[PDB]
Design a protein around this ligand. Structure first.
Ligand SMILES: Cc1[nH]c(C(=O)NC2CCN(c3cc(C(N)=O)cc(Cl)n3)CC2)c(Cl)c1Cl
Ligand SMILES: [Mg+2]
Ligand SMILES: [Mg+2]
Ligand SMILES: [Mg+2]
Length: 194
């Protein structure tokens, strides 16, 4: 309960109290904005010269998974908070605050690190769960139905349109959209402009 952790909790309270001020609306438009908030991080990492693939998956029950092959959100214990950098970054994330559940897997230092959250609150300390020969960041989230009180169901065409545009605007980045909500009938569109 240091000043750092107190500020974190106040920040989550503030986002959840006035979500529309952060993401425009809590309508279907705001729901889809959650995806762009996450994907923008991957785009910046690609433009910085450290990533070139981004994958957005609509999973069963309208979870969203975003994966990039960037450097991975750092995990070193931070000066300000005395907590892993990734935890500080995600506990101040609007998407995390407005998600009933969110998971991160960081591939970095030939290690896979995992943390989970509910409404932005970490459920356990960042944990090493395995090894890897890749780098990057995986984020999985389920939008909070307490916040998004019109719908929590994503529109494939809405995601598709903007993903295609993002690939066209940010040449060289391979951006893939896949709908896995119905395991019997899976749709994928992959964009890569030169
Ligand atoms: C899906 C996704 N991807 C990213 C992402 O790629 N973030 C970048 C931000 C800058 N990062 C680094 C890397 C280093 C480093 N030298 O490896 C040091 C620092 Cl100080 N930040 C790499 C991850 C985020 Cl954040 C989310 Cl959410
Ligand atoms: Mg942002
Ligand atoms: Mg950034
Ligand atoms: Mg490329």
């Amino acid at each position: 309960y240091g000043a750092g952790q107190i500020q974190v909790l106040e920040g989550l309270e503030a986002v959840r109290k006035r979500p529309g001020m952060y993401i425009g609306s809590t309508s279907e438009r705001g729901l889809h904005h959650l995806v762009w908030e996450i994907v923008d991080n991957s785009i910046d990492e690609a433009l910085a010269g450290y990533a070139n693939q981004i994958e957005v998956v609509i999973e069963k029950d309208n979870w969203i998974k975003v994966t990039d092959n960037g450097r991975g959100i750092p995990v070193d214990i931070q000066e300000k908070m005395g907590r892993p950098a990734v935890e500080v970054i995600l506990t101040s994330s609007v998407v995390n605050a407005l998600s009933q559940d969110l998971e991160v897997y960081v591939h970095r230092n030939e290690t896979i690190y995992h943390q989970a959250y509910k409404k932005g609150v970490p459920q356990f300390d960042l944990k090493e769960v395995g090894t890897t020969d890749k780098t990057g960041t995986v984020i999985r989230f389920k939008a909070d139905g307490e916040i998004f009180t019109e719908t929590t169901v994503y529109n494939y065409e809405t995601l598709q349109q903007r993903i295609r545009e993002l690939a066209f605007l940010n040449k060289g980045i391979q951006i893939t959209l896949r709908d896995e909500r119905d395991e019997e009938n899976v749709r994928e569109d992959s964009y890569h402009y030169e």
